Amino acid sequence: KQLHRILKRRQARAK
Amino acid sequence: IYLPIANVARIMKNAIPQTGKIAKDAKECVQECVSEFISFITSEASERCHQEKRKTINGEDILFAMSTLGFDSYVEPLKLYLQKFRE
Amino acid sequence: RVQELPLARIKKIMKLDEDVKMISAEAPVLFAKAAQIFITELTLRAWIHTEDNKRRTLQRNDIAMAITKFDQFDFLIDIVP
């Protein structure tokens, strides 16, 4: 249930 | 951006037995985890607000994001804390 | 007391999000209590591994083990590797 939000947060932290 | 380490450490100390100890790097780790928790929930709420064409993240958006992402047990204590906070 | 947590710091963290425009007054208050609940549960779950290793000092690796074992902590995968 967290997977898609996790993927998105990884992209946000990279910036 | 992190919550103050002394506040994080106090909450941690209250969780463990009285004779336990917490290493400084464990306190720093939890400090990092808390900030990621706030950002993780906020990201879910902000995407929903954007899709629904609203400009303000409200309390219901935060609580709904928590419920969706596996933190539904937080909803009732948070509502009670906020209500008592407002009284 | 949860009221000691600085609401401005919580708001600052939220505002790092690229899609946050305006934040309601109640949102940081809710996160203050949530932060206390989360820290407490994460610490207790890590302490399981402290005691399982015959230690009395909670260490970073104990938190890492707790994160892997609980689905609710999946989102910390990159924070504590």
Side-chain angles (χ1 to χ4, degrees), chain C residues 7-14 16-44:
Chain C
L7 299 181
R9 193 89 51 97
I10 293 167
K11 180 170 178 172
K12 201 175 164 202
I13 296 163
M14 297 191 56
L16 301 168
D17 189 283
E18 271 188 309
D19 295 297
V20 166
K21 295 171 184 195
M22 278 208 287
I23 301 166
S24 68
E26 73 264 16
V29 177
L30 293 168
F31 269 131
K33 179 64 176 177
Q36 184 207 37
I37 294 170
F38 172 76
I39 295 165
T40 299
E41 191 65 28
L42 177 61
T43 299
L44 280 176

Side-chain angles (χ1 to χ4, degrees), chain A residues 5 8, chain B residues 41-58 60-62 64-65 67-69, chain C residues 17 19:
Chain A
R5 190 49 56 198
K8 295 166 175 138
Chain B
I41 299 303
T42 295
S43 176
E44 176 85 8
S46 77
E47 169 146 38
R48 179 81 56 171
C49 289
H50 175 82
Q51 291 183 3
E52 309 185 336
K53 282 191 136 243
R54 291 182 291 104
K55 296 190 73 93
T56 305
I57 315 291
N58 63 39
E60 283 77 19
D61 298 318
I62 296 303
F64 190 74
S67 186
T68 297
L69 292 167
Chain C
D17 189 283
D19 295 297

Side-chain angles (χ1 to χ4, degrees), chain B residues 1 8 11 20-21 41 43 45 54-55 61 75 79 82:
Chain B
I1 318 143
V8 172
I11 298 160
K21 288 158 55 163
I41 299 303
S43 176
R54 291 182 291 104
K55 296 190 73 93
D61 298 318
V75 173
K79 295 190 73 263
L82 174 65

Side-chain angles (χ1 to χ4, degrees), chain B residues 11-71:
Chain B
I11 298 160
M12 286 183 83
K13 190 62 217 63
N14 289 341
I16 66 169
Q18 180 186 128
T19 61
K21 288 158 55 163
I22 303 165
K24 175 178 201 199
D25 51 315
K27 297 174 180 172
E28 289 172 347
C29 175
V30 171
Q31 189 175 33
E32 283 188 74
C33 289
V34 168
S35 282
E36 179 64 26
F37 174 74
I38 295 167
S39 292
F40 177 73
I41 299 303
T42 295
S43 176
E44 176 85 8
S46 77
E47 169 146 38
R48 179 81 56 171
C49 289
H50 175 82
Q51 291 183 3
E52 309 185 336
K53 282 191 136 243
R54 291 182 291 104
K55 296 190 73 93
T56 305
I57 315 291
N58 63 39
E60 283 77 19
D61 298 318
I62 296 303
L63 294 172
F64 190 74
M66 309 163 167
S67 186
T68 297
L69 292 167
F71 307 90

